[PDB]
């Protein structure tokens, strides 16, 4: 959790399950072989208040 910084907010989060072409290193395949996870969820601000 970050409070107000623009440059600290997470934009995506992804998992990998395979490499890419010929590269063996997961640190080199992870940037282009990911799968973005995450769903949003609605609440009720009147109930919260």
């Amino acid at each position: 959790y970050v409070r107000l910084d623009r440059d600290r907010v997470p934009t995506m989060v992804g998992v990998t399950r395979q490499s890419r072409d010929t590269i063996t290193q997961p640190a080199l395949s992870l940037s282009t072989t990911n799968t973005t996870v995450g769903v949003p969820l609605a609440l009720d601000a009147r109930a919260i208040t």
Partner: protein, 49 residues
């Protein structure tokens, strides 16, 4: 605050270091210690926060 930096470094294994800690190492105020700043902002400097 504590007495030994080894005990301080063992304490900061399970503690987070998100904003980063600061040491003093010269002549601290009330004993050997680390300082962890929080995520508040300074606003009295116009073009950037």
């Amino acid at each position: 605050y504590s007495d030994t930096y080894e005990v301080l470094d063992r304490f900061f294994w399970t503690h987070d270091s998100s904003a980063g800690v600061l040491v003093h190492y010269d002549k601290p105020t009330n004993g050997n210690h680390y300082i962890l700043g929080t995520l508040t902002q300074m606003v009295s400097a116009p073009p950037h926060i």
